[PDB]
Symmetry: C3
Subunit: 383 residues, 3 copies
């Protein structure tokens, strides 16, 4: 539906992933932090290509599509919230209920036969760990835990993070994240120097294809994921050679990080431990449109009480955010960007030449192709 | 000719209107004010997608296509008017007469077989009421009166105005203007409060469908238009309600305006009286290209003589222009622009959900569809 | 392929020229000066739509395609030359030899089965007269002399120049440079006044529509060009008339220049003498992409020794560069740009109306259609 048929035909093993340029419908996605949306101060955003309005009413979050049923304007051009439970289009005053999207009045014509017979699309929203998730799908949603990685929701896990808009397709972000050889780009990171990380240049793989990863398509709550096992079973490269001469070495630090690396639908990576042996990183690459994503980064640490939490917050602002979320992951941002040209006409999916460590990426494309809950298309966007 | 055939088959009530992205060929259009073009100072503009040159020679206006027949450059890049009656292309000196577009000379080759055998396209041009109108069409033009609203050309009507370029398709602008319910957006206007206008929020429509409008396809000079009669049979709504609670109002005003409202081919709105009970407003939404229009605003006041026009003038400059043309209509500008995205891909014409006050708009779309003098296409722009 | 068949069928005699929007493959093109490319300091450029990396290694120049075989990134986003004879991709460290493009190592996986089984595209590169030429084609190159105008390579000919990126398609630049009547645009040039050039407004042909050009098919080096003879055989126009009245005069002058004017594949103009009797101008219009070219300008002067070269360089910097290359050719820059719109949708190639002096341009279009060594396409830009 999104990609030229010629191209889709020529990718067989994961064609629906190739098609999912706008992301996967019927999943939850984080879009902002809870502290970024205040009582009665609606925020606008784009997700899976659809513009959305999110408001907080009596502490609770609601989501309406930011497109009036009448002439298709964004309501957010001029927000008119005249009662606590409704929003009034600025143009001809069609008035919708935030709770169910029902067109419940029209100030310019109280007699209209439309009133009570139309419904603006709404989306479920839920807050968890200080993060706003929108279920960008139809019908009653599954629990949040299905579309989060293991441990993200643990009672004791304190989540902090950072969000920004990145100009690449979401899949280029996912694949960069889950790619075992990409760690080559991080070899000069200030995190690696200053936090004394052990970091190989990459890994020589051992065993055949199926041993490189482990698919998790079971799971209690229905999570679908892939664990990368390359560097559990492979030989780390610490001395990179060209024609037999050592030209570059890996980082010989003392802290062991990234023992477990996994990727989960709808597109969230878990790195454990990281950036320190006590923490986890959970980052989402959230489809905004064809060319754009939210890079929704979080760092988790278990905390039993409240002064732990206060200690963690101060470590986050002074150390983990600048050193790791920026100083390590910035190189990820421009690596994603650098893949844009080759994949932008959709021909990179056919012309790429993969090698052995891309086994993890192929597993991901397969898992996503068969376990996503729907392919967002242009018909979902303009409909 | 301009829109996907699948879309045209779904808007059968008014398909040629939806097709008319560039506007309607074979009508007169105002493009500037007479006083903005001085003797021997050609001006450049784009109309219906076509770049044009207008010049004032011995006080008479002339219009040539601003595209040399030879290599297709705009002559306006470097104007060379070497005699009063001619223009010489800056590139190889092909020289045209303003009066008939004939290639009368070539300075670079005075023996060319082309000389006297080629003709650059010219368009009729006429000045009335201090406005420059160009007949963007072929053959013998009609009287200007066919393509202007009633009273505009009355002998004592003094016209004053303002022109600017707005980034929406001309149809967005026409429909916004003729929309009986859009006046919602004007509820906080400075004009409404400072000139004691009795402006409702909308109208509960009364009587039957056929009574909401009155098509004029029966004017003796050949005018084609639609009167909006929603305020004749309908009830004005001055109190805005949601759930039976008053949330908004029309407030304090004694002056009745805009009881006479009509839209006329090729796309000009008449509102009478407005902005005061002794004036009327005529405004055009002139297609520049697919994405742009001139918003050619005029105010008409009947004036007996030279002194009465001077008093109209002072008052236009100090009160009516800042308060009404700018103050009141600025909201119209941002409303048009807010419909751009919905209609950009031609999908809005199928996906809109109209209500009762949009009878006026539908009547216009049918009128435009039936009585236009041709659809401008890209083949007219290029060839 | 690059152009619609409904246009190509309408330009019989020169359709391969109209199709060659990206230029002609399998020719040498100049892209920069020798001094701009130093030992061990790779430079990036785009040629025939392809991103290329050039490097200097032990004085010798090499050219690799700037696109990794793995995931299609430009290597030049972060250049990593880890040994003299190789470049290592910054992403997963696939490592290529400059000399043959072979994938000789991967730092991230020294056991990959890709090593020694993939080859990145290379192109021959050669330096002549201080200018770097890349053979943008396949297989073994021809001699450089085939794709350079007569006398550019003469032993005594000292070459100085200037290069810049211009936003027009390359063909518009070529046609402007070889166009006999375009000299009309140069009529007010300071060069013309200050160096007392004889410069007519144009030339009325001397007789038949078949003695205006001389096609050079022969030439033992294999060069393919057209000489413009109108200047030698026509009647110069020094008094331009409209309605029989003189409106403009040409520039009288002592110095006769541009006796010998020729255009050569792949798109290089030779003007002799110019801008003074003992000098020549050779300029290339080198396709970068569909909308852009390098304007690669050179002036040749025979210099017997170092004192003559030194004298020439001072005169170049103080006068010829500012007065001729900048002052005089600046009007050719905007003349090219002014043709963009008409030819942008490919319709100008059908809608243009040619006159007698365009016989030169037509002879060039047919020559180029005949003797080009292949049309560059998007598929070559990809694969
Ligand atoms: S566009 Fe929202 S009420 Fe008309
Ligand atoms: S383009 Fe106008 S005379 Fe050649
Ligand atoms: S993209 Fe160059 S090595 Fe992976
Ligand atoms: Fe990374
Ligand atoms: Fe309005
Ligand atoms: Mg709800
Ligand atoms: Mg005329
Ligand atoms: Mg002179």
């Amino acid at each position: 539906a999104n990609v030229d048929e010629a191209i889709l035909k020529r990718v067989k093993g994961w064609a629906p992933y190739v098609d999912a340029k706008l992301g996967f419908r019927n999943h939850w996605y984080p879009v902002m932090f809870s502290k970024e949306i205040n009582e009665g101060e609606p925020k606008t955003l784009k997700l899976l290509g659809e513009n959305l309005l999110v408001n907080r009413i009596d502490g609770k979050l609601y989501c309406l599509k930011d497109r009036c049923l009448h002439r298709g304007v964004q309501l957010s051009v001029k927000v008119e919230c005249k009662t606590k439970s409704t929003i009034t289009c600025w143009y001809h005053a069609w008035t919708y209920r935030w709770e169910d999207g029902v067109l419940c009045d029209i100030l310019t014509n109280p007699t209209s036969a439309q009133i009570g017979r139309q419904k603006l699309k709404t989306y479920p929203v839920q807050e968890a760990k200080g993060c706003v998730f929108i279920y960008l799908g139809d019908g009653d949603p599954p629990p949040l835990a299905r579309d989060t990685p293991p441990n993200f929701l643990d009672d004791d896990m304190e989540i902090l993070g950072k969000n920004q808009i990145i100009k690449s397709n979401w899949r280029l972000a996912v694949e960069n994240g889950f790619d075992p050889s990409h760690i080559y780009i991080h070899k000069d990171s200030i995190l690696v120097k200053d936090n004394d990380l052990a970091l190989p240049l990459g890994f020589a793989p051992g065993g055949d294809r199926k041993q490189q990863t482990r698919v998790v398509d079971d799971d209690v709550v229905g999570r679908k994921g892939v664990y990368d096992l390359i560097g559990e079973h492979g030989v780390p490269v610490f001395e990179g050679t060209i024609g037999g001469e050592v030209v570059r070495e890996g980082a010989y630090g003392e802290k062991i990080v990234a023992n477990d690396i996994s990727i989960w639908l709808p597109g969230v990576l878990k790195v454990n431990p990281f950036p320190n042996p006590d923490m986890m990183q959970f980052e989402w690459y959230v489809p905004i449109d064809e060319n754009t994503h939210y890079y929704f980064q979080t760092l988790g640490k278990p905390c039993a009480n409240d002064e732990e939490r206060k200690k963690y917050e101060q470590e986050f602002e002074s150390k983990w955010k600048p050193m790791a979320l920026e100083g390590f992951n910035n190189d990820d941002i421009w690596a994603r960007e650098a893949m844009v040209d080759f994949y932008a006409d959709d021909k990179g999916w056919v012309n790429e030449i993969l090698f052995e460590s891309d086994e993890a990426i192929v597993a991901w494309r397969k898992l996503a192709s068969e376990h996503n809950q729907g392919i967002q298309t242009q018909a979902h966007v303009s409909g």
